[PDB]
Amino acid sequence: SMRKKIFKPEELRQALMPTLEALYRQDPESLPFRQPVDPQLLGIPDYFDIVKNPMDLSTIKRKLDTGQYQEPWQYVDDVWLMFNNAWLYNRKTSRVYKFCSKLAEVFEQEIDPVMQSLG
Numbered sequence: 017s018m019r020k021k022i023f024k025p026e027e028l029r030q031a032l033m034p035t036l037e038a039l040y041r042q043d044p045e046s047l048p049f050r051q052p053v054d055p056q057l058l059g060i061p062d063y064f065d066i067v068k069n070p071m072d073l074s075t076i077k078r079k080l081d082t083g084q085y086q087e088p089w090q091y092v093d094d095v096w097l098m099f100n101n102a103w104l105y106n107r108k109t110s111r112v113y114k115f116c117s118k119l120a121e122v123f124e125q126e127i128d129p130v131m132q133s134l135g
């Protein structure tokens with residue numbers, strides 16, 4: 017459509033925060049995603065050469081709390097950025113990669129009914 021639907025920050029928080037909570041509830045799978053990747057502590061100095069736009073759950077949460085998403089697709093784009101970054105950087109046998117794949121399965125199931133409700 018040409019006409020932006022207008023969303024209030026608290027409407028987005030009430031609708032979308034439970035979908036982010038569903039990812040946090042996955043344990044162990046969300047544990048690597050709860051804070052930003054720290055390449056110094058992890059000893060991976062190539063990380064920001066490969067991942068140009070880092071993203072993690074705590075940043076998405078803060079963006080929802082501070083009204084930085086005008087529309088739900090911007091939130092979905094950040095969750096997907098987090099996933100794509102982890103699939104790009106990590107080997108397919110790693111825990112982080114397989115945990116990412118489980119988070120993406122969970123998010124897909126939670127986000128669809130929410131998007132139907134916001135349209």
Ligand SMILES: CO[C@H]1CC[C@@H](n2c([C@@H]3CCCC(=O)N3c3cccc(C(C)(C)C)c3)nc3cc(-c4c(C)noc4C)ccc32)CC1
Pocket residue numbers: 044047048049051053054058060101102105106111112
């Ligand atoms: C709570 O604070 C901590 C601090 C960081 C820690 N962290 C680990 C640790 C480091 C020690 C060795 C080990 O083995 N780690 C490890 C690896 C996988 C799983 C686990 C669990 C035991 C937590 C499940 C540990 N590596 C991570 C890799 C990434 C990553 C990369 C690269 N690119 O995208 C992502 C996402 C992000 C965070 C990581 C997770 C949590």
